Design a protein around this ligand. Structure first.
Ligand SMILES: Nc1nc2c(ncn2[C@@H]2O[C@H](COP(=O)(O)OP(=O)(O)OP(=O)(O)O)[C@@H](O)[C@H]2O)c(=O)[nH]1
Lengths: 503, 226, 392, 551
């Protein structure tokens, strides 16, 4: 079936189901060599790859010498890497981000109107890391030339989402939240009852146990080809269960975002999805492979390791159909659980939420579900991030239970845009703390911030958006939005909302 | 003016009226030193224009005479400035104390040429000029006779004083004292030296008192002549 | 934390000046020539195309480019914490406007001789260094006139206006340090680039009893050598007169100044301890306040102080830096659905807290003691603003 | 890991001297203060009572004032939690009080004085409160005053009954009840005049002693069983032949209305016991000691646990979930412990985290009197009742997680310790769990701990933590686990397989070698030796194949 879709390099992308509009808006991606050969007669010798080929990118390509000049020259002046630049092109502001590795430079440029600078910086880090996950060091992706036809697809999806978000009311909500959530060091996670967590953990653990009686060595006189490292399961875009290390979970989710596999599962019934790749994880035989199997809104990712308990591998092997059958069979057994997981999405697994429109326009449980103080629920929206375990909690389809009128829908957008700005300070604090920790081997700084917030007025009401960073041995980020009528303490909300939370 | 009168005990008491905590008390444009109720002092005021080539220390000279901090960075003066300096003195002829209010007018060398009105502005009532030359620049020294004949011009009854600057940079001296003496042999000038050093609030007083008293002697005396 | 400012004539590629500072302290250090040529050459490379280069940054530092008219490119590099593109962009507008005040637009645009500027732009160095260095004023950052609340709403304004008739100009103001106590209606109607730079020009200079500086007016007469006069009648306190060729300073005799200012000597003496603190001493500030910044957005004026609680850390220098960094943050987020308040809580542990609110036309920011309850931050700022509303 | 709390004191007294910037403690007001308005704004924003209302039918502010005066005029004899938000107090001189609450907040105070003239007016010693009757003991007479209910104490019948016993010498008598009418037991420290415990029947003819016993040792406490309603459980202070303190534990059963001892257990103490508490599952006894030792014993096992309290733990209150034990003191200090007796840090609500090993009430509200009583408000259950001698009264509120739906069970402590990577503590709870009673919780707790550790880089410390976690099932102290092994063996062995693969990859060899033996897998031995072929460490060699053939 899917065997015919296996590529000569061992890659498999099988899917079965049950950009002219952007070209007026300037954008570009380029990979450049920083090693000049001025003796060469070749034009554009500096460009190893670029995308798109369009009027939209041609203007930025024509000024590419600026990026090369600044990257080396500013670094020579400050002793540090260049991270960004900002230009006006055809009267429109564009931000360009830089990432330099091994004497090569990656550049991404997007219009300021759709993409604030801090979003762009997170996007270049996300692109460089996802490319590294798929290909190893960036030269392995770009300098091969032959990879261009698929790099174009990767960038085509990247630009389409960045410039026309949600164009690829729940879909509009996802577009509103994507600006913040896709750049978090974690994945969206769904909070479940322990009864469901135990059933999911037990079923998921079968893969790591690798009790492959049908593939036993004594039956084939052969060592099994891979050791299963761990796996993680998603439903309808939410992670529900994982036995995999936090760093591997984030890299894998980034792959799935770039191929839109998770948001596709959120809208459509997929009859089958099978993906197989060699992958290049952060660890340290050194060969690892990623297998993804999807079914009926479920997406299951498994990492496989060569060597160890397993046989060594060389060359570029195709997918092992036996391991694929084991993953598919495991995922099929969860179909009977699907009604219970949906019930958890239908209800509020978290705190109770109120609609903003209401303000301008069993009971023990409902009071336990009030994150905010007082008899009235002033909570509208929140994002809770556990930075250690890579998981975050948001409102779900609850947002549709909220009216979503002219007041509420605008207020969701304001929340995510403000939280992007809040993270900028938190990210700066965290990097400084890591730098200090290594330097150990400032007064009036605004940088080491624990809280930030903004209050807004609205009309068809005061709407308060606040976030907090925790720098203690258990680092956390919390974002909450609530009505101005009730005062709140970030510590009490953080305790109530993070207590008992683990992957 | 009695030489080193300020070193006497009576002199110390009068220095105290311009000092606070052994530091200069700067005065506002219409502010005055406060005398003891038993003390009556004759107050005189003079209009002094500071002139010379850029980089000669004209701003630094006034700050030293004022007891104000002397700048290190050579910012150019952009326009007309006035510094007001208060300094008591005992008179040798009258035995009375006369207190001076010196107005140091300082247009800046560049400002004078860019704006034609500024030079006449500094001359509305001027009754003295200070001509600076550097010890480390012969050109400012050799141009001095021209400055003496052209800035003062033909005007009668005008006080002209030449001051050397940057003496502390002795290793860089371009003009030996022999040449300065030869200059004084032709011009009979009241030559003064200032070291415009950027220790404590009284340290400036001890060094600047020599030049302030020499300045007082010409301004006071010529006022008695008029 | 080094800062460097470069200016080049855009057409010649020849640097007109370089200025620098470290830690807010002015310095003589300049960039290497090959570096400077690359900093300007890259901008002009973009200019050969329609694409403008406005900014770039590195992990530790930021750089901003501006292109003024046809003749000037300004490039600034800064390692200072709290630096942002808006903060630098406003600073470059202030640097350019300072260049306009000293040589004018007629000389600065359409440049015929780079050498003429090399000698004439040195005149701007003291004011430029003030923008790059540490200062007690926020007008450069806010584009508001730095102001202080007068001891009286009557006698100061009445005397000032009568004096303006005596001096023959409609534009008169009294300021302590860089802070305006009172001003006439002519003086108040000046546009931001002029209204802010004028008191900065006066307050950045070494203290003088009197001044007459050439100013080319950023509005109305950028081609005419109008003159700014000041009279420092009391220490730290001076009048500004914005004048044509008359009066001469020699005609502003002490008797004239005694008639118009001796009757106010007592409240003027009071204005000196007032200088450092924008509010009346009896103003009911909360004891947790370390400092205050109030802006009136329609009237282009603001109050600033770090005086209200002298006993606690930070030092006054440190307090001003926190407020400047916070304003910069407010300026890019809360200020251009409609934001009305903002706050910060700093670490490590119990660090300092900051608040801001906007009520209609006026916006207040506070620096607060680390012990102040976080839930009271909004209600405190709101009450403080309401208490301030009658004053501004 | 710590618990976050806030305290509500139901009093109007200014004498508490509570800091006005302290948001963790609340007080009621009548019609130092510099931050009080800010605290009031928060309290009003949260719809807390602040100034109490006086309404014609219910003068709450004034009725509270009388209650405070009752506490000062006379000792409270009894406090009982009739419902999760309702309670009653009984005072000397017979005044009864009833309070009704909403969450932590007091809503009304009722003072009932109808009983005052009905009593013999001897000193009470102890009492039992009513659903249909009140029983009062006395120090100076061998009588139980009996009040039958059918102001609300209006439909009264008054009587009293003679009790067999010793001559009255101001006897420190105590009372307990199993299920209102069904059983009453009266006892005191020290044939009928030598006996010190009485089993009392409840009849239409009044209270009577059905039988009496004399215990071997004076009781520290007495309880009725909830699962065994006819059992009277005692903890008694005793001395060994080596003259060392012991806590006796004895069960007395009523058989044909004859009370007799059925079983005796003994637990050695490092010092003489000063307090007794039984847990909610009635399978553990917790004993406080004079030297501040805390000793726990599990009835189903020979296992005991020790801990050192800072507080001289004179009073103990077990949370109904069984997950939390609190140590109180007469000194007004509170300390929080795990069921494993691992210390838990505690904090009152504040803008920043700052946990402490112990909580001193004196630090926050300057209480002028000794702490007498702690109770969990069992008729979720996040309220702890506090009573000081001569007041104040109040409730300590515990913040509970939303995502746990307000639950604070042992499973939730595993999740909370894993949240903070406090692995040994999570393991000690897992060892405290009974596989034969709590199998679902044991599998979940183990899975959380193992899944947490297998995500981590291996270290020698973590090798021990992973081994210990599986050791809680594979190496039980109780061989009777064989009854339930068939239920748990599968999910546990699956974790063991994961551990084998994890340790093989780190070339530890020996642990993977032994794990394969305990697991008994046919093919797993084959990964052993296969690695050896590239290492030279052929400890198993060909034996892997012989074992595969035998399995
Ligand atoms: N060492 C030393 N340096 C001096 C002295 N006088 C002036 N300088 C230096 O000379 C430079 C300029 O001094 P100014 O006082 O500004 O000379 P100016 O005559 O006021 O120059 P304009 O403002 O253009 O008129 C500074 O860098 C000072 O440090 C002196 O006596 N000793």
């Amino acid at each position: 079936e899917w065997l015919d879709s296996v590529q000569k390099n061992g890659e498999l992308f099988y899917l079965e189901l049950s950009q002219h509009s952007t070209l007026s808006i300037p954008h570009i991606s380029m990979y450049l060599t920083l090693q000049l050969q001025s003796e060469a007669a070749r034009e554009e010798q500096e460009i190893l790859y670029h995308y798109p080929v369009s009027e939209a990118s041609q203007k930025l390509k024509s000024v590419r010498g600026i990026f090369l000049t600044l990257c080396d020259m500013l670094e020579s002046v400050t002793g540090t890497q260049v991270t960004s630049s900002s230009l006006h092109l055809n009267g429109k502001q564009i931000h360009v981000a830089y990432l330099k590795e091994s004497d090569k430079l990656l550049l991404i440029g997007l219009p300021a109107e759709e993409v604030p600078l801090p979003q762009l910086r997170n996007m270049i880090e996300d692109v460089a890391q996802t490319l590294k996950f798929m290909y190893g060091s960036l030269d392995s992706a770009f300098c091969q030339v032959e990879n261009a036809p698929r790099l174009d697809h990767f960038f085509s999806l990247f630009f389409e989402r960045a410039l026309r978000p949600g164009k690829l009311s729940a879909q509009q909500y996802a577009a509103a939240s994507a600006v913040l959530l896709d750049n978090l060091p974690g994945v969206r996670w769904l909070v479940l009852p322990q009864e469901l967590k135990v059933e999911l953990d037990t079923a998921l653990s079968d893969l790591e146990a690798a009790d492959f009686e049908e593939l036993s060595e004594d039956y084939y006189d052969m060592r099994r080809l891979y050791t299963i490292l761990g796996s993680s399961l998603f439903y309808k875009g939410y992670m529900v269960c994982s036995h995999l290390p936090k760093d591997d979970v984030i890299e894998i989710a980034a792959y799935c975002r770039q191929h839109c596999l998770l948001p596709l599962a959120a809208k459509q019934r997929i009859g089958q999805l099978i993906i197989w790749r060699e992958v290049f994880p952060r660890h340290h035989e050194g060969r690892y492979f990623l297998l993804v199997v999807g079914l009926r809104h479920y997406l299951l990712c498994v990492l496989l390791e060569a060597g160890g308990c397993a046989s060594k591998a060389t060359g570029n092997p195709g997918p092992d159909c036996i391991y694929v059958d084991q993953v598919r069979a495991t995922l099929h057994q969860l179909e009977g659980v699907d009604s219970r997981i949906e019930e958890q999405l239908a209800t509020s697994p978290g705190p109770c939420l109120s609609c903003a429109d209401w303000f301008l326009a069993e009971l023990e449980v409902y009071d336990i579900m009030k994150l905010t103080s007082g008899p009235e629920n002033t909570l509208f929206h929140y994002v809770a991030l556990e930075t250690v375990q890579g998981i975050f909690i948001t409102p779900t389809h609850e947002e549709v239970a909220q009216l979503g009128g002219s007041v509420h829908s605008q207020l969701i957008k304001n929340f995510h845009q403000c939280c992007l700005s809040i993270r900028a300070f938190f990210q700066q604090t965290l990097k400084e703390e890591k730098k200090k920790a290594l330097s150990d081997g400032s007064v009036s700084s605004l940088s080491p911030v624990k809280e930030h917030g903004v209050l807004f007025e609205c009309s068809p009401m005061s709407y308060w958006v606040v976030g907090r960073l925790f720098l203690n041995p258990k680092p956390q980020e919390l974002y909450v939005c609530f009505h101005d009528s009730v005062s709140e303490i970030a510590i009490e909300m953080a305790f109530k909302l993070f207590f008992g939370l683990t992957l | 003016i009695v030489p080193d009168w300020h070193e006497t005990v009576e002199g110390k008491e009068y220095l105290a009226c311009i000092l606070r905590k052994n530091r200069r008390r700067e005065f506002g444009l219409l502010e005055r030193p406060v005398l003891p109720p038993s003390v009556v002092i004759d107050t005189a005021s003079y209009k002094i224009f500071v002139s010379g080539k850029s980089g000669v220390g004209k701003t630094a000279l006034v700050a030293k005479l004022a007891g104000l901090e002397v700048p290190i960075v050579h910012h150019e003066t952009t326009g007309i400035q006035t510094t007001v300096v208060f300094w008591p003195a005992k008179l040798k002829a009258s035995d009375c104390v006369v207190m001076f209010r010196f107005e140091f007018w300082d247009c800046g060398e560049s400002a004078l040429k860019k704006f034609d009105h500024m030079l006449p502005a500094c001359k509305e009532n001027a009754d003295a000029f200070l001509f600076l030359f550097s010890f480390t620049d012969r050109a400012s020294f050799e141009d001095l006779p021209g400055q003496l004949t052209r800035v003062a011009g033909e005007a009668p009854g005008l006080v002209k004083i030449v001051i050397g600057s940057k003496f502390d940079q002795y290793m860089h001296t371009d003009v030996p004292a022999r040449d300065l003496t030869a200059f004084r042999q032709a011009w009979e000038l009241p030559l003064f030296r200032v070291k415009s050093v950027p220790l404590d609030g009284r340290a400036g007083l001890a060094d600047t008192a020599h030049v302030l008293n020499g300045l007082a002697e010409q301004l006071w005396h010529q006022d008695q002549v008029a | 934390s080094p800062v460097h400012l470069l200016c080049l004539a855009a057409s010649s590629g020849v640097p007109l000046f370089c200025r620098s500072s470290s830690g807010g302290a002015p310095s003589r250090q300049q960039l290497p020539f090959s570096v400077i040529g690359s900093l300007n050459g890259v901008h002009m490379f973009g200019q050969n195309l329609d694409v403008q280069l406005n900014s770039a940054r590195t992990e530790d530092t930021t750089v901003v480019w501006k292109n003024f008219h046809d003749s000037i490119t300004l490039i600034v590099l800064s390692s200072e914490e709290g630096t942002s593109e808006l903060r630098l962009e406003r600073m470059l507008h202030m640097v350019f406007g300072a260049m306009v005040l000293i040589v004018g637009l007629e000389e600065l645009t359409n440049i015929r001789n780079v050498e003429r500027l090399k000698k004439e732009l040195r005149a701007s160095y003291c004011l430029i260094d003030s923008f790059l260095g540490n200062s007690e004023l926020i007008g450069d950052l806010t584009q508001c006139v730095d102001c202080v609340i007068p001891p009286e709403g009557s006698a100061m304004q009445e005397t000032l206006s009568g004096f303006a008739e005596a001096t023959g100009t409609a534009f008169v103001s009294l300021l302590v340090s860089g802070r305006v106590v009172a001003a006439t209606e002519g003086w108040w109607r000046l546009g931001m680039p002029e209204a802010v730079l004028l008191p900065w020009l006066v307050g950045s200079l070494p203290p003088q009893a009197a001044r007459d500086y050439p100013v080319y007016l950023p509005h109305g007469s950028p081609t005419v050598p109008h003159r700014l006069l000041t009279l420092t009648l009391l220490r730290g306190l001076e009048l500004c007169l914005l004048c044509g060729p008359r009066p001469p300073l020699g005609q502003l005799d002490p008797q004239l100044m005694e008639r118009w200012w001796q009757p106010l000597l007592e409240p003027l003496r009071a204005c000196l301890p007032l200088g450092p603190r924008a509010l009346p001493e009896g103003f009911p500030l909360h004891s947790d306040i370390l400092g205050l910044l109030l802006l009136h957005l329609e009237l282009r004026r603001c109050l600033f102080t770090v005086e209200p609680s002298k006993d606690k850390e930070p030092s006054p220098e440190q307090r001003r830096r926190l407020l400047r960094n916070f304003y910069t943050l407010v300026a890019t987020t809360h200020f251009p659905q409609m934001p009305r308040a903002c706050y910060l809580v700093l670490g490590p542990g119990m660090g300092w807290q900051l608040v801001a609110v906007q009520l209609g036309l006026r916006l207040l920011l506070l620096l607060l003691s680390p012990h102040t309850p976080t839930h009271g931050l909004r209600s405190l700022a709101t009450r403080t603003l309401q208490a301030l509303t009658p004053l501004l | 890991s710590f618990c976050l709390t806030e305290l509500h004191l139901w009093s109007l007294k200014s004498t508490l001297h509570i800091a006005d910037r302290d948001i963790g403690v609340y007080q009621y007001y009548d019609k130092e203060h510099g931050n009080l308005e800010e605290k009031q704004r928060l309290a009003e924003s949260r719809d807390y009572p602040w100034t109490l209302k006086n309404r014609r039918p219910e003068k709450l502010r004034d009725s509270l004032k009388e209650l405070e005066e009752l506490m000062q005029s006379s000792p409270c004899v009894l406090s009982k939690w009739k419902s999760k938000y309702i309670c009653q107090l009984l005072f000397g001189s017979g005044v009864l009080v009833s309070l009704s609450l909403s969450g932590p907040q007091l809503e009304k105070v009722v003072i009932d004085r109808s009983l005052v003239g009905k009593l013999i007016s001897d000193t009470i010693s102890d009492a039992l409160l009513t659903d249909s009757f009140i029983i009062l003991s006395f120090l100076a007479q061998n009588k139980l005053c009996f009040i039958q209910f059918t102001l609300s104490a209006l439909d009264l019948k008054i009587s009293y009954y003679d009790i067999p016993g010793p001559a009255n010498r101001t006897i420190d008598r105590h009372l307990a009840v199993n299920s209102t009418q069904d059983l009453v037991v009266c006892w005191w420290p020290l044939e009928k005049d030598r006996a010190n415990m009485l089993l009392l029947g409840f009849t239409q003819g009044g209270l009577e002693v059905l039988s009496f016993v004399r215990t071997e040792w004076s009781p520290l406490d007495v309880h009725f069983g909830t699962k065994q309603p006819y059992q009277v459980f005692t903890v008694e202070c005793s001395v060994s032949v080596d003259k060392e303190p012991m806590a006796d534990s004895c069960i007395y059963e009523s058989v044909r209305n004859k009370l007799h001892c059925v079983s005796v257990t003994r637990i050695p103490l490092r010092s003489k016991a000063i307090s007794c508490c039984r847990n909610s599952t009635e399978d553990k006894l917790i004993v406080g000691c004079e030297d501040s030792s805390v000793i726990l014993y599990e009835a189903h096992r020979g296992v005991t646990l020790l801990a050192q309290a800072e507080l001289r733990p004179s009073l103990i209150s077990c949370h109904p979930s069984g997950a939390i034990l609190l140590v109180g003191s007469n000194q007004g200090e509170l300390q929080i412990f795990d069921i494993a007796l691992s210390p838990i840090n505690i904090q009152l609500l504040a803008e920043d985290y700052s946990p402490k090993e112990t909580l001193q009430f004196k630090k926050f509200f300057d209480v002028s009197s000794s702490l007498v009583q702690m109770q969990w408000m069992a008729p979720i259950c996040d309220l702890l009742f506090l009573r000081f001698n001569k007041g104040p009264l109040g409730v300590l509120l515990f913040k509970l997680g939303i995502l746990t739906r307000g639950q604070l069970g042992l499973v939730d402590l595993i999740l909370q310790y894993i949240h903070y990577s406090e692995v040994y503590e999570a393991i000690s709870i897992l060892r405290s769990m009974d596989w034969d009673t709590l199998g679902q919780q044991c599998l979940i707790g183990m899975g959380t701990i193992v899944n947490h550790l297998l995500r981590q880089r291996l270290t020698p410390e973590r090798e021990a933590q992973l081994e210990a976690s599986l050791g809680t099932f594979y190496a039980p102290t109780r061989p009777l686990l064989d009854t339930t092994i068939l239920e748990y063996r599968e999910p546990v062995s699956k974790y063991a397989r994961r551990l084998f693969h994890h340790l093989l990859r780190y070339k530890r060899f020996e642990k993977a070698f032994l794990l394969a033996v305990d697991i008994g897998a046919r093919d797993l031995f084959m990964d052993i030796h296969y690695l050896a072929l590239d290492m030279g460490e052929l400890a198993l060699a060909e034996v892997a194949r012989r074992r595969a053939h035998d399995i």
